[PDB]
Design a protein around this motif. Sequence first.
Motif, PDB file in Angstrom:
ATOM      1  N   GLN A 160       0.816  -1.191  -0.008  1.00 46.31           N
ATOM      2  CA  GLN A 160      -0.214   0.076  -0.017  1.00 46.31           C
ATOM      3  C   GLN A 160       0.828   1.147   0.138  1.00 46.31           C
ATOM      4  OE1 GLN A 160      -2.378  -1.680  -0.388  1.00 46.31           O
ATOM      5  NE2 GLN A 160      -1.870  -3.427   0.765  1.00 46.31           N
ATOM      6  N   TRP A 202      -6.597   5.057  -6.765  1.00 43.72           N
ATOM      7  CA  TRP A 202      -6.746   3.578  -6.786  1.00 43.72           C
ATOM      8  C   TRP A 202      -7.634   2.948  -5.654  1.00 43.72           C
ATOM      9  CZ3 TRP A 202      -4.210   0.820  -2.973  1.00 43.72           C
ATOM     10  CH2 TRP A 202      -3.259   1.013  -2.654  1.00 43.72           C
ATOM     11  N   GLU A 203      -8.291   2.001  -6.006  1.00 41.05           N
ATOM     12  CA  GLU A 203      -9.066   1.224  -4.920  1.00 41.05           C
ATOM     13  C   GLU A 203      -8.486  -0.275  -5.129  1.00 41.05           C
ATOM     14  OE1 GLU A 203     -13.147   2.232  -6.260  1.00 41.05           O
ATOM     15  OE2 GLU A 203     -12.933   4.159  -5.981  1.00 41.05           O
ATOM     16  N   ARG A 204      -8.337  -0.830  -4.151  1.00 39.01           N
ATOM     17  CA  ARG A 204      -7.992  -2.183  -3.973  1.00 39.01           C
ATOM     18  C   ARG A 204      -8.903  -3.099  -3.072  1.00 39.01           C
ATOM     19  NH1 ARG A 204      -1.863  -2.154  -3.217  1.00 39.01           N
ATOM     20  NH2 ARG A 204      -2.062  -2.038  -5.570  1.00 39.01           N
ATOM     21  N   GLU A 231       1.194  -8.674 -12.188  1.00 32.97           N
ATOM     22  CA  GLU A 231      -0.235  -8.025 -12.829  1.00 32.97           C
ATOM     23  C   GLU A 231      -0.992  -8.122 -13.808  1.00 32.97           C
ATOM     24  OE1 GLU A 231      -0.461  -3.730 -11.507  1.00 32.97           O
ATOM     25  OE2 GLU A 231      -2.707  -3.709 -10.843  1.00 32.97           O
ATOM     26  N   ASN A 290      -5.215  -7.177 -11.910  1.00 34.92           N
ATOM     27  CA  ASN A 290      -5.542  -8.403 -11.144  1.00 34.92           C
ATOM     28  C   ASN A 290      -4.084  -8.933 -10.806  1.00 34.92           C
ATOM     29  OD1 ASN A 290      -8.601  -8.975 -10.571  1.00 34.92           O
ATOM     30  ND2 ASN A 290      -8.434  -8.251 -12.523  1.00 34.92           N
ATOM     31  N   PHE A 299      -5.550 -10.134  -5.264  1.00 32.78           N
ATOM     32  CA  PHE A 299      -5.334  -8.304  -5.643  1.00 32.78           C
ATOM     33  C   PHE A 299      -6.349  -8.164  -6.709  1.00 32.78           C
ATOM     34  CE2 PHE A 299      -1.631  -6.374  -3.370  1.00 32.78           C
ATOM     35  CZ  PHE A 299      -1.675  -7.134  -2.114  1.00 32.78           C
ATOM     36  N   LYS A 300      -7.149  -7.123  -6.449  1.00 33.50           N
ATOM     37  CA  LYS A 300      -7.851  -6.514  -7.595  1.00 33.50           C
ATOM     38  C   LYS A 300      -7.850  -5.079  -7.185  1.00 33.50           C
ATOM     39  CE  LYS A 300     -12.299  -5.420  -9.881  1.00 33.50           C
ATOM     40  NZ  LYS A 300     -13.583  -5.417 -10.022  1.00 33.50           N
ATOM     41  N   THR A 301      -6.854  -4.326  -8.300  1.00 32.91           N
ATOM     42  CA  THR A 301      -6.964  -2.850  -8.097  1.00 32.91           C
ATOM     43  C   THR A 301      -7.425  -2.258  -9.235  1.00 32.91           C
ATOM     44  OG1 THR A 301      -4.645  -3.362  -7.066  1.00 32.91           O
ATOM     45  CG2 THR A 301      -5.202  -1.306  -7.558  1.00 32.91           C
ATOM     46  N   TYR A 339      -7.443   1.501 -11.055  1.00 34.18           N
ATOM     47  CA  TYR A 339      -6.884   2.759 -11.028  1.00 34.18           C
ATOM     48  C   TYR A 339      -7.512   3.791 -11.926  1.00 34.18           C
ATOM     49  CZ  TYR A 339      -3.100  -0.533 -10.328  1.00 34.18           C
ATOM     50  OH  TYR A 339      -2.244  -1.609  -9.773  1.00 34.18           O
TER      51      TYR A 339
END
Lengths: 218, 218, 218, 218
Positions: free
Chosen positions: B60, B86-88, B141, B153, B170-172, B174
């Motif tokens: 992070q 960005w959201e994760r 990713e 991902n 992980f799923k981010t 942007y």
Amino acid sequence: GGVIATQMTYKVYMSGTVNGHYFEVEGDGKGRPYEGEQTVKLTVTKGGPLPFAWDILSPQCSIPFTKYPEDIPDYVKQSFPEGFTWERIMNFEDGAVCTVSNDSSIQGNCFTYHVKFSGLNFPPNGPVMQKKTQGWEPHSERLFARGGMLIGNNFMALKLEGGGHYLCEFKTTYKAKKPVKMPGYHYVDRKLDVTNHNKDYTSVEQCEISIARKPVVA
Amino acid sequence: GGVIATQMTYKVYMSGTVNGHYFEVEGDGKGRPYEGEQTVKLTVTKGGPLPFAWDILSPQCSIPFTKYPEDIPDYVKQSFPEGFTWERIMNFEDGAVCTVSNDSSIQGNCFTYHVKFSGLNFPPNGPVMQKKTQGWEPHSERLFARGGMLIGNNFMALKLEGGGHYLCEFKTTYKAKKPVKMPGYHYVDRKLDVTNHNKDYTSVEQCEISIARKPVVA
Amino acid sequence: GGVIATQMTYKVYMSGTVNGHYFEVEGDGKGRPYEGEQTVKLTVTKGGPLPFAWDILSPQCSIPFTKYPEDIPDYVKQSFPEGFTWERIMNFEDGAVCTVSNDSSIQGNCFTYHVKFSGLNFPPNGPVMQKKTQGWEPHSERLFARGGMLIGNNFMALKLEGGGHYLCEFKTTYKAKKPVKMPGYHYVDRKLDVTNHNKDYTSVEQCEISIARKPVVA
Amino acid sequence: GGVIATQMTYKVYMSGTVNGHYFEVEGDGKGRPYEGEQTVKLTVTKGGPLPFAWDILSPQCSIPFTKYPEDIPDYVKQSFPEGFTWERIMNFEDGAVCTVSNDSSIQGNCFTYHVKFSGLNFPPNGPVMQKKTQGWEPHSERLFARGGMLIGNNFMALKLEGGGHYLCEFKTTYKAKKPVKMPGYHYVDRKLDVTNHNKDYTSVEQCEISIARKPVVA
């Protein structure tokens, strides 16, 4: 009752973010814990007007107010005066996810709830960001004991403007701050309705009825 | 480059909760954005010592420092000076879930990252609360464009003391604050290592190498 | 090689259901296992024409044909002559789910694959039932060892007519029928293309290139 | 009733695989559809003795036998004589996943159910492969209408030898073969018990009581 009066009041201090938008909420509630009757008034003290549906926050604003039959141990009520905390995961069908944490304490005749709310991935054109939701359908939480914690699961559903539903799965973990007598496999049926609010929902009033019971068919 | 120097620095302001435990972190970083080389030093300014593994926070603490070939549009670099967020979502195999949000801005030669972290349901006897993790395996990713956003991902994995792995998906997402030229289907390979830290990880140093590329076999 | 020739052939016997629609498929393949080169021709022997996109079945029609560097143990190749099985879960972003099981055996210079496919919840107006998919993007499988099994994860994506992607997550578990030397954390990059087919896809030809490698950035 | 007698019988033809192990089952049932009372006797006709817990198959062996109040439209009963199908996803907490499809038809006074079952990823040392389960806790299915289909969700739980529970989430989609009057948001409470069986469960008898109702608290 003995530590929790037949008539109680409570305050809510909630803070959080939704798709990165920060906000703060404060509330004043009251109810009859042993009757499972409850009402609360919220105020968006910071970050308002909220750019998202209020319905995602309504269930975050009071487990002690649940009517438990005598033959079913009341996990939450037994936790006091020490109190308890709860952790919640909300998975919406369009991918949005929220994690919510609470700390419930008591002082005299008033309960104090501190809440942290984090929600994200709500699609910009979705029901939440477009405010197309119209309250939660009455619900039924499946509860059971594990590791000294009470675990609840609920298949929630928000009613949509123009008909249809917007689904969300709830998973709530209740952690008493001291060991208590654990209940058996049971359910808690609830009704949660917004009974008043101003135009931009910066002010809201909610009514909730919660009743525990054993399986209907057993 | 033209808006982002060949050598940059950055500051991290992170706040959050893990199983209800609040904390705050501040960091100072530097690196060569076009070389995908990067290093940062963190300090647990509040809530320390942390009762959980530092590894869940290391990822992070900085997308602008990714080496992009010329034939692959750099979504993040193009977003400036306006910047991006960005959201994760992090889903661990033992049920723990974390939601993380970032806001990346720029001022001169320094990037500023504001981060909110919310993680919960980490089992008390699990690898995270017992601090049995030993860093992340190098990762890759998968990235693609959708709705003007870049979606990533990653199948992450934390190495465990005594062998084995602790998986996390992980799923981010942007979100550039202004439209930019969207890239095609590609990947970003990374290496993230803690290069120094004190005994209770209230102080940490991290090194990261990030390189974008097209599919290996195409 | 020593048990697997430089040039091999193989047969596919697949049976299954999609949204309740039963079907059977048979195939004849050939390739260079140590070169990771492979081609196969399928025939819908029963239940055709299929009312759903062929792309969901293409990845079910051959792990032995993967190019492994010498310094990375080849889990699947080592399993023979005994052979191995694989179990797969496919989660599509619109809710569809498929479970797939394979049994891979060998006899002389030919591999025999028996496959059971079960897929359901494909929306009637979705890309699969409406046949709007146009092949898989090249992909990269994350692989690691656990319990003597090889576990793979892949972020797949089907290209859509008119642009965009239809996402699907793959999780494949490879179970050798005898213990073998386990590999370290690695990846397998692949390219899978339909190279020929008749009008209603009752006949199809597929080409696949698979190459194992260590992390790009390490 | 008018197309469905007050007393009915039914036959079950089930086929499937569990971790690759093939099997076939046949059953003879009877009950009072309007009373929600039901009983059935199963026989493992092929692939027995089964190397896995019978409990995962018990819920796959009859929706027409559900007691519906007059003010709640009975989706399934209205579908006949045409009939209906159902698709089910079962997600167990240890990663196992099952996809199940049914076709329910009628001929005179007998219902015929054809079932395909596919389950995999059941850990070798888990409760299912080690046969440590002891029946399902009574359950409550949340049901609602969408796209002319009836969608049900259930938080199931298998009791474990030595105490505790093994969780599984159910999602069942009922598809009538002809349009019918859709019901409102409601629930179906059930009790499912194995009332007899031989030593290796190659023969089993099951009793089930199903009753529909509106929300308890509304």
